[PDB]
């Protein structure tokens, strides 16, 4: 029933606006020259690094570290969200640990491009904007951490998905069940299936003159997987040249 699919698509998007403190519809109404309200401080050179860390509360590591942070506080949100996820905390626990160690960072990318366009991305929850420029600029095992992620971003929000979209497409990427070390593969391919019909339907009323974005949306998953990839081989460099950086216990057991 295409009404029970409707149900699904609004239950998941409620759950959303409240584990996500920072949705799409407010990060581009920071970005679009559409406020005095409150629009970011801009963060585009060293000096405005420094007026910034007082206006928002060595250079490239510590920015590393910022991001560090970040993908914790956002790995408990996305954690918060998936429990929502109708069917999910009925599953083996440990199956759903698998789930999060390897669709966690997928879904980090996807909504980190909410917070980008081409020229950088909002920081501290939308109060600060960070250039794409200065990010390539810093010192070089790190200024290509964030490069392929705009790459990225530029691609997916070509496709103009909006809050209600993306958390039905954030649900179904969580419940894959071809993720490595799977116990019982069955119920969640039965969870995902209908996450799938509930994506569809969505992509169909919201964006009917859109076609085949379901599928076009669906083939972003690639795209996904080898940012993740990129990304891991580059802090496997990282640990190795700075022997005195350290990583979170929370985003190290993800890596494996
Ligand atoms: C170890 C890291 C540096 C964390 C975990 C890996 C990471 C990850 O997988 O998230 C890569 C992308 C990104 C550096 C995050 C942190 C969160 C962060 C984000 C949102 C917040 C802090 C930064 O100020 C800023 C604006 C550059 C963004 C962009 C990219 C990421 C997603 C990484």
């Known amino acids: 029933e295409s009404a029970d699919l409707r149900a699904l698509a609004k239950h998941l998007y409620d759950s959303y606006i409240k584990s996500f403190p920072l949705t799409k519809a407010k990060a581009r109404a920071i970005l679009t020259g559409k406020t005095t309200d409150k629009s970011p401080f801009v963060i585009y050179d060293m000096n405005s690094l420094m007026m910034g860390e007082?206006?928002?509360?060595?250079?490239?590591?510590?920015?590393?570290?910022?991001?560090?942070?970040?993908?914790?506080?956002?790995?408990?949100?996305?954690?918060?969200?998936?429990?929502?996820?109708?069917?999910?905390?009925?599953?083996?626990?440990?199956?759903?640990?698998?789930?999060?160690?390897?669709?966690?960072?997928?879904?980090?990318?996807?909504?980190?491009?909410?917070?980008?366009?081409?020229?950088?991305?909002?920081?501290?929850?939308?109060?600060?904007?960070?250039?794409?420029?200065?990010?390539?600029?810093?010192?070089?095992?790190?200024?290509?951490?964030?490069?392929?992620?705009?790459?990225?971003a530029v691609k997916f929000n070509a496709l103009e998905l909006d809050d209600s979209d993306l958390a039905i497409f954030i649900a179904v990427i969580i419940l894959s069940g071809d993720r490595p070390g799977l116990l019982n593969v069955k119920p969640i391919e039965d969870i995902q299936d209908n996450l799938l019909q509930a994506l569809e339907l969505q992509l169909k009323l919201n964006h009917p003159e859109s076609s085949q974005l379901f599928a076009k949306l669906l083939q972003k998953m690639t795209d996904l997987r080898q940012i993740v990839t990129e990304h891991v081989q580059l802090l496997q460099v990282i640990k190795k040249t700075e022997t005195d950086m350290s990583l979170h216990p929370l985003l190290q057991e993800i890596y494996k």
């Open 54 to 152: 007082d206006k928002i509360k060595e250079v490239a590591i510590r920015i590393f570290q910022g991001c560090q942070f970040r993908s914790v506080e956002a790995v408990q949100e996305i954690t918060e969200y998936a429990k929502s996820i109708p069917g999910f905390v009925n599953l083996d626990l440990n199956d759903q640990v698998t789930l999060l160690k390897y669709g966690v960072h997928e879904i980090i990318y996807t909504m980190l491009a909410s917070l980008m366009n081409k020229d950088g991305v909002l920081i501290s929850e939308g109060q600060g904007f960070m250039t794409r420029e200065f990010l390539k600029s810093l010192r070089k095992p790190f200024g290509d951490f964030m490069e392929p992620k705009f790459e990225f």
